Design a protein around this motif. Structure first.
Motif, mmCIF file in Angstrom:
data_model
loop_
_atom_site.group_PDB
_atom_site.id
_atom_site.type_symbol
_atom_site.label_atom_id
_atom_site.label_comp_id
_atom_site.label_asym_id
_atom_site.label_seq_id
_atom_site.Cartn_x
_atom_site.Cartn_y
_atom_site.Cartn_z
ATOM 1 N N UNK C 35 0.780 -1.223 0.000
ATOM 2 C CA UNK C 35 0.000 0.000 0.000
ATOM 3 C C UNK C 35 0.815 1.278 0.000
ATOM 4 N N UNK C 36 2.045 1.227 -0.520
ATOM 5 C CA UNK C 36 2.888 2.420 -0.530
ATOM 6 C C UNK C 36 2.404 3.443 -1.552
ATOM 7 N N UNK C 37 1.908 2.986 -2.703
ATOM 8 C CA UNK C 37 1.358 3.907 -3.694
ATOM 9 C C UNK C 37 -0.018 4.422 -3.289
ATOM 10 N N UNK C 38 -0.780 3.622 -2.540
ATOM 11 C CA UNK C 38 -2.101 4.047 -2.092
ATOM 12 C C UNK C 38 -2.010 5.288 -1.213
ATOM 13 N N UNK C 39 -1.036 5.317 -0.302
ATOM 14 C CA UNK C 39 -0.892 6.451 0.606
ATOM 15 C C UNK C 39 -0.561 7.717 -0.173
ATOM 16 N N UNK C 40 0.366 7.617 -1.128
ATOM 17 C CA UNK C 40 0.747 8.791 -1.903
ATOM 18 C C UNK C 40 -0.396 9.270 -2.788
ATOM 19 N N UNK C 41 -1.189 8.346 -3.334
ATOM 20 C CA UNK C 41 -2.354 8.752 -4.114
ATOM 21 C C UNK C 41 -3.376 9.469 -3.242
ATOM 22 N N UNK C 42 -3.582 8.980 -2.018
ATOM 23 C CA UNK C 42 -4.488 9.657 -1.098
ATOM 24 C C UNK C 42 -3.995 11.063 -0.779
ATOM 25 N N UNK C 43 -2.685 11.227 -0.590
ATOM 26 C CA UNK C 43 -2.145 12.560 -0.327
ATOM 27 C C UNK C 43 -2.346 13.472 -1.538
ATOM 28 N N UNK C 44 -2.109 12.957 -2.748
ATOM 29 C CA UNK C 44 -2.399 13.735 -3.952
ATOM 30 C C UNK C 44 -3.836 14.233 -3.941
ATOM 31 N N UNK C 45 -4.774 13.320 -3.686
ATOM 32 C CA UNK C 45 -6.186 13.678 -3.742
ATOM 33 C C UNK C 45 -6.539 14.686 -2.659
ATOM 34 N N UNK C 46 -5.910 14.577 -1.488
ATOM 35 C CA UNK C 46 -6.158 15.541 -0.424
ATOM 36 C C UNK C 46 -5.605 16.918 -0.769
ATOM 37 N N UNK C 47 -4.506 16.977 -1.525
ATOM 38 C CA UNK C 47 -3.884 18.257 -1.852
ATOM 39 C C UNK C 47 -4.438 18.907 -3.112
ATOM 40 N N UNK C 48 -5.146 18.167 -3.957
ATOM 41 C CA UNK C 48 -5.526 18.727 -5.252
ATOM 42 C C UNK C 48 -6.467 19.933 -5.190
ATOM 43 N N UNK C 151 4.511 16.030 -7.154
ATOM 44 C CA UNK C 151 4.354 14.582 -7.067
ATOM 45 C C UNK C 151 5.245 13.929 -8.116
ATOM 46 N N UNK C 152 6.185 13.099 -7.669
ATOM 47 C CA UNK C 152 7.121 12.392 -8.549
ATOM 48 C C UNK C 152 6.858 10.891 -8.437
ATOM 49 N N UNK C 174 3.089 29.376 -13.363
ATOM 50 C CA UNK C 174 3.470 28.234 -14.180
ATOM 51 C C UNK C 174 4.258 27.201 -13.385
ATOM 52 N N UNK C 175 4.671 27.526 -12.160
ATOM 53 C CA UNK C 175 5.241 26.530 -11.275
ATOM 54 C C UNK C 175 4.257 25.478 -10.807
ATOM 55 N N UNK C 176 2.958 25.667 -11.063
ATOM 56 C CA UNK C 176 1.927 24.696 -10.716
ATOM 57 C C UNK C 176 1.383 23.979 -11.948
ATOM 58 N N UNK C 177 2.182 23.881 -13.005
ATOM 59 C CA UNK C 177 1.747 23.277 -14.260
ATOM 60 C C UNK C 177 2.036 21.779 -14.213
ATOM 61 N N UNK C 178 0.977 20.972 -14.114
ATOM 62 C CA UNK C 178 1.100 19.514 -14.057
ATOM 63 C C UNK C 178 1.895 19.081 -12.827
ATOM 64 N N UNK C 179 1.702 19.795 -11.719
ATOM 65 C CA UNK C 179 2.506 19.567 -10.525
ATOM 66 C C UNK C 179 2.086 18.326 -9.744
ATOM 67 N N UNK C 180 0.843 17.867 -9.893
ATOM 68 C CA UNK C 180 0.351 16.696 -9.174
ATOM 69 C C UNK C 180 -0.114 15.590 -10.110
ATOM 70 N N UNK C 181 0.155 15.707 -11.404
ATOM 71 C CA UNK C 181 -0.292 14.731 -12.385
ATOM 72 C C UNK C 181 0.707 13.584 -12.510
ATOM 73 N N UNK C 307 9.427 26.464 0.653
ATOM 74 C CA UNK C 307 8.688 25.528 1.485
ATOM 75 C C UNK C 307 7.624 24.825 0.652
ATOM 76 N N UNK C 308 7.216 23.652 1.108
ATOM 77 C CA UNK C 308 6.222 22.871 0.403
ATOM 78 C C UNK C 308 6.399 21.389 0.672
ATOM 79 N N UNK C 309 5.687 20.591 -0.122
ATOM 80 C CA UNK C 309 5.620 19.142 0.047
ATOM 81 C C UNK C 309 6.047 18.481 -1.255
ATOM 82 N N UNK C 310 6.936 17.494 -1.156
ATOM 83 C CA UNK C 310 7.349 16.688 -2.298
ATOM 84 C C UNK C 310 7.112 15.220 -1.967
ATOM 85 N N UNK C 311 6.447 14.518 -2.881
ATOM 86 C CA UNK C 311 6.134 13.102 -2.748
ATOM 87 C C UNK C 311 6.922 12.322 -3.790
ATOM 88 N N UNK C 312 7.655 11.299 -3.351
ATOM 89 C CA UNK C 312 8.466 10.487 -4.255
ATOM 90 C C UNK C 312 8.160 9.012 -4.033
#
Ligand SMILES: Nc1ncnc2c1ncn2[C@@H]1O[C@H](COP(=O)(O)OP(=O)(O)OP(=O)(O)O)[C@@H](O)[C@H]1O
Ligand SMILES: Nc1ncnc2c1ncn2[C@@H]1O[C@H](COP(=O)(O)OP(=O)(O)OP(=O)(O)O)[C@@H](O)[C@H]1O
Ligand SMILES: Nc1ncnc2c1ncn2[C@@H]1O[C@H](COP(=O)(O)OP(=O)(O)OP(=O)(O)O)[C@@H](O)[C@H]1O
Lengths: 403, 372, 375, 396, 399
Positions: C35-48, C151-152, C174-181, C307-312
């Motif tokens: 479930x390592x990808x599930x957690x990161x997907x949930x974080x994406x959805x919470x941040x979108x 999101x990487x 433009x720093x937010x262009x496709x940033x969570x896709x 500052x900010x959040x990076x997901x890898x």
């Protein structure tokens, strides 16, 4: 040109086939399958190298006059998951051109590789180029008669700067779309209407200024003689059976071609029966190409031209009394042309001798045979050739037949 | 179609290199930038002529299947701060084509002229053409056996949301050589073929249930499905529990797998390791089945050929890495595998005669030697 | 924009799950299918939603950026050999948006009806809109600081043979262009970085030819130079020590390509280097150029102070074991103020990290999950 | 190629006209419907045969490039109230084809008989043939200079190599007699040129040791840019402070100009009229550069030929109408310009010998005379009243 | 309809602008940069909501008729690497939709979001729908005259089932391509030739069976009235200056339009001067739309119609003696129309009073002003206007 024999290997529906052609008329008959269209397409593919020797063919780049991958043979086996191709596909044609030069050329394709021609096919292209260069000459005094190549398919009714006198053009424009499967009726009616109206206006400016008759008298004569030649050819087929004759152009009828009947008067051709329009289309297609190819005859261009014509379903939309007259009419209108036609009608098959008939049969593995009918067909009742050649009883299998 | 030895001269990072291959499995071990991809690229360049002797190669768009000007080694002159291009680049291969037929062929390129092949390399194309001719013969008594030839690089990977009727050429034996050495993903080809298999099999079931009134085609289809399924099981089942890949119409016409504790789930919703391992094994299996129909049930167990794998252990966790080599040897006992890795866990229980450690000099002279 | 806590209910493999995040770095360790990808997907959805409060989100084609029917957990009934779908799926997030602003928001989906959000998610969207409005103001005295959001995933990978500016590409946002896709964003960086280098070389040529217009034109040169060196140092923090390659730059001699240099090896294009080097360079550049674009006023601490959040996901792809022992510290050194959430299954990545940064993911026979700190 | 005299009879509206041109600049001045486009079209037809044999212009066959039946004058009787179709149409042209090589040729048309040129026009055709064959060579110490033929009409405003080859050399005659010059194509090709130049400049920055690697295709680019900048400077640098049109990646990837006090300004903020003037001058300079490589930067200052412009002051502010003629003269001092205008601000800056006032009586006895007053330095009102007979006081 | 004031915020080249319009004629003058085309385009955008309520609208997808992202202001700063937009872009129009009711509607766009209209813009569309539905019902005794909206751009010369009498169509076809930037001369010539051939053929048919005269006398009369009005309009402009008049269609000239001059006879319009062709194009464009919109006027459709016409470079291809006559000719041929035109010719500016002149000036930060000339311009010599309103000395700066 002329074709005397044809051989097919691994073509569409034939594993192997050898067929020989009569000098004047030969009729293909097939009880079932698609063999006749296959043979016609093979012959039409074997004639393309010649037409490729004319830069006028630059106007045609159709991806159908060369062998394609789907033309190769697929063998499906019920007990195998795989399905392979049969390679190579070969078309071998034996014939005569130059009126004395016998030849045998070949086309072949290997799987997905591009098609490959042998040496004699390139020689045929070169002989096509010789006629082009000799025709383009201006100082030339000796005259050149070009050969005719036409294809008339079953879809010749769906889709439904003019210059006549001799020139570099107006003679290579008789080879434009000469082997295509689409309808070519618009480019005939436009040419005919232009010819008629220009001839009438030339006569108008003629009697307007008679002093200028230095060369405007022979031009009118040529434009009149071409019309005479075309009209005679059309009449030879329509008049003796239907009574209609003398296809003409009448500006009064809303700029539309019309014909005339002794009792029904003048009516536009576009409102006559289907069979008459079909016959007119065929005969005009042959005749205007003949005249545009050999202007230096101008009155017998339809009576001395040579070449090959291919007709699928020759007797389409014709009633039986007209099916006993089509073949002889075609022979009479074009006495020095080779005809290869396909038909179903027993009425047609009773008007030719058994040496002009080929019956196509296929084996279970695809081997083909093109045989002559054992019995006689010339001058016989229709029901006799219906059962002797086609194997169809003349009395239908109605309920009462069993008793 | 074994390959026994390879030699390189003035190729990308190697001034000169000689390497010998084991009959069944050889593993190249080295860190980043040591030349593990260079060796596999050289091998596929050396093998491409045989494939060029086939009709399926007319649709190859991969520009890296020929030697390029960028493949010629560059030397750095530190005093002048310059790069000089050495020439020519050469690739020599020695091996066996058929039973009792040993050969040596060579590929070359100089400067910016087009690349050149020697005399024995064209005989490889000739042999390919003769095999293609033999397969296309009606009413033949002798059987033809075709060797497998496949390259699985990093372009194969199935990342998130990649989501990668059949043509008449897709039903041929020789369609087993379609994009076989290209840097591409080949998943949709397999998916279409496998779906066709399952739908035909279900058609036969429905007909033989509705109105009993042919019987060998069903057997052929069943045996093909069994071969592919067992091949995939050999790798997935023991470690993960997911065993049987099938086509399902209940799940919106998708490929699915089964688990004993978890139920039936589509393959596109499983984890990265599952998806990539399944794609890897299926890529070999369906080609094994398509190339040699007459085996019918040992197509994967009896086919011969060469498979090249770059970074065989991507997306697999350390307990899965200790099983991959033996699983591949069990699924395909007759194939020559050449694989690359940098993970020690992949070598836990492998013989030392299968490992080649890669090294270079300060001048670019390479070695590929067994561990001591 | 820190996030502190996450809760999941009926989301893919988890019946219920609670997880707490560390302020700087958190590593999720587990095997395949845990479930390592599930957690990161949930974080994406919470941040979108915050990103939805921007214009750049109008071009998002990623269908996995919303809860789907396929995300609802399925239970296997072995007796009946059946699958039954649980409902609803729920995602709850707690965190801090700006200084002294703590919040809790929630996302929900039931059955096959469209997904739904509560009030605080709409307030997050409103905050995004207000930030955009403030950035688009002329003659403003207050500065605006923008947080990084990235999101990487595995779609970032640069495999074999994988690979003019629009007026919107010159904006901060433009720093937010496709940033969570789930996409690769390498060409954006390549194009913009090439523009930077060409402008800088233009200025060099002009100041060499006609030294007569370097007044209020030299400040622009200074800004370009500082941006280039910020990005270059960020990339150097990861590649130089272990591989020796450094100083990515645009070269017109090499057919107008991006290029790197080595002390023993020469000067070579980036597309001809190894897999690990290409992927590490792409990974670090993706963060660096966004750091530079979002906050122009720092000018060479853009990467060091943003500052900010990076997901890898799977941070150690294509890196050999000696490189894996350095990645976490390198990322902490390059970006000291960012919150990193990364996943792995390789033990070598955890060689010298504190135990308070590790979450081991476990599940029981009924689907109840745990994310526990190691003993 | 220079013209010195033109004679017409039975042409569109002229029963007979005789006009002698000036060495450098001549302006046709007349109100609407006074035979200005008529004269320009006559001259355009006269110079066509020199273009018919250049291997690129022997493709285009325009109906306007040969006399037509509509050019034949029509007379009105007012008694029968019918239009008499007069004939024949006649054009006779006198000029020079080379250094001290006088000539005189003619063209004619009768009724519907297609026009037939004289063999003296085939002399010009074969002269063009000789020029094109001479330039086609690749080894000669002598240098072949080509003439520039250009026609810019009232439709001028709407719609990758500098090698010394026989193709680039002959690209200067592309649509030369039906040319168009707007701003979009100009910015496209100028931007391409500047990008190609900056590539080499940066390459030389990075690797100084490779100075000798290139320089055949590079000096062409550099000197062409120098010539174009020279011409546009001749246009704009005096009225305003701008100069040295350039491409800048730094400044938003745009074409910009420089002002000693105001710095850099983009070209897209200017009015749509001055932009087209810059485009026109740039296009003329670019054609000159492509025609004669062997000068490489004075190609614009030393090319010879004839340029025809209809409504030279179209879409120009009254401030710019006072410097267009002198700018064209200063940018191309070896070209023969024939221009048409009706503005009084255009004629307030030239000398009387260039001005040509057109007249036509009730029959067609056209006249092309010189003003009886003075124009050079005069005010607008005096020019209006004296030359055009139009009172500066509106009749309200 | 009528427009009395206009206000722009963050439009193409204006940070903000306020401009009022004269009731009959107003002329825009700008010595530098753009700005006249900006104002004309803003006005043309403010009128589209009316035409949208007639089914001749964005169905054809003319994307130029709504505010676009490229229409928003964009500020480049030399000391910053980034470049932002100015948002929102607003167009505010005050006017009169009909005698008695004033209105103030607004259009705006925020960055990349789709453009948004306020309530009164939708009300304007609703008024258009009211007029449409009232026109479509013939079960009425009283008539209603439609308003005219036309745009004539600078590209009106680049590439130069007919029904006249009343109908559901033939009145809403006067709004087709009424705000487009392309040339619309082909449709006019087709309609005009059809009208003339129908008129001649029907007056020939009258000779056959005059029994239907009572029905064929009125109908023919219609085709003989329209033409008249059209011709008159044209003769109001191209006669007192040049002498040509009476535009006609004649098959004897290869079936193309011709005109007559007392001394030069009849010549096709395609072979006349540029000014004549331009003027004929403009006046015909106005006149045939006027007649197609209000047939029931039937003799004065060009003299009682109301609406707005926008003309860029009105005096193009006209010599100075003709530049002192264009404006009054337009006022005389169309006395109940509002005209907004652009010029840079001192000859034109001396034929109107200073109340009809707007001078556009722009600040360094984009702030705009539309002021009136301080001095007088009515009935003054050309140079006085030249150096009083445009700041150009009449003595050229020769050596
Ligand atoms: N033309 C060249 N001349 C010199 N050196 C080159 C050239 N092209 C590439 N190289 C160097 O050769 C190295 C070869 O590394 P390669 O990627 O082949 O091996 P690897 O890192 O072990 O494999 P991988 O990570 O792809 O599995 C490249 O990293 C690059 O540094
Ligand atoms: N709708 C669902 N209901 C139940 N279980 C599901 C559902 N969808 C997916 N699953 C299971 O949940 C597992 C979640 O594993 P996931 O891919 O999230 O983690 P991972 O293997 O640690 O990550 P990664 O390999 O992608 O880095 C999937 O493998 C699949 O087995
Ligand atoms: N065939 C013809 N016979 C008689 N008169 C003609 C003929 N063709 C054109 N004309 C007349 O000649 C005049 C044409 O003038 P011309 O085309 O020279 O325009 P211009 O206004 O002087 O020039 P510009 O186009 O530069 O404004 C008009 O009077 C036109 O009626």
């Amino acid at each position: 040109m002329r074709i005397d024999k044809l051989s097919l290997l691994n073509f569409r529906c034939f594993k192997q086939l050898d067929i020989t052609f009569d000098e004047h008329i030969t009729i293909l008959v097939a009880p079932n399958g698609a063999g006749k269209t296959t043979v016609l397409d093979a012959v039409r593919l074997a004639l393309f190298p010649f037409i490729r020797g004319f830069d006028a063919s630059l106007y045609v780049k159709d991806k159908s006059l060369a062998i394609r991958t789907e033309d190769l043979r697929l063998i499906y086996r019920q007990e195998a998951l795989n399905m392979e191709m049969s390679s190579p596909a070969k078309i071998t044609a034996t014939g005569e051109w130059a009126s004395g030069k016998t030849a045998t050329w070949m086309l072949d394709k290997r799987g997905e590789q591009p098609p490959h021609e042998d040496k004699m096919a390139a020689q045929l292209t070169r002989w096509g180029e010789q006629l082009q260069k000799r025709v383009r000459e201006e100082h030339s005094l000796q005259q050149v008669e070009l050969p005719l190549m036409l294809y008339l398919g079953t879809a010749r009714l769906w889709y439904q700067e003019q210059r006549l006198d001799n020139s570099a053009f107006s003679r290579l424009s008789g080879y434009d779309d000469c082997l295509s499967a689409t309808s070519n009726y618009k480019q005939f009616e436009q040419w005919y209407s232009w010819l008629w109206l220009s001839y009438r206006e030339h006569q108008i400016t003629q009697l307007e200024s008679p002093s200028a008759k230095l060369k405007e008298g022979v031009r009118v004569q040529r434009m009149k003689e071409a019309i005479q030649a075309i009209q005679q050819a059309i009449n030879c087929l329509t008049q003796q059976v239907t009574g209609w004759h003398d296809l003409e152009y009448s500006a009064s009828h809303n700029q539309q071609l019309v014909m005339s009947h002794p009792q029904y008067g003048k009516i536009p051709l576009s409102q006559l029966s289907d069979g008459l329009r079909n016959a007119v289309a065929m005969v005009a297609d042959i005749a205007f190409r003949c005249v545009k190819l050999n202007p230096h005859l101008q009155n017998d261009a339809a009576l001395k031209t040579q070449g090959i014509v291919l007709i699928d379903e020759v007797d389409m939309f014709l009633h039986p009394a007209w099916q006993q007259q089509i073949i002889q009419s075609l022979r009479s209108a074009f006495p020095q042309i080779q005809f290869i036609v396909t038909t179903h009608s027993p009425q047609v098959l009773s008007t030719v001798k058994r040496e002009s008939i080929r019956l196509l049969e296929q084996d279970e593995n695809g081997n083909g045979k093109a045989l002559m009918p054992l019995g006689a067909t010339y001058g016989e009742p229709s029901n006799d050739v219906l059962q002797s050649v086609m194997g169809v009883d003349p009395q239908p299998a109605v309920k009462e037949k069993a008793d």
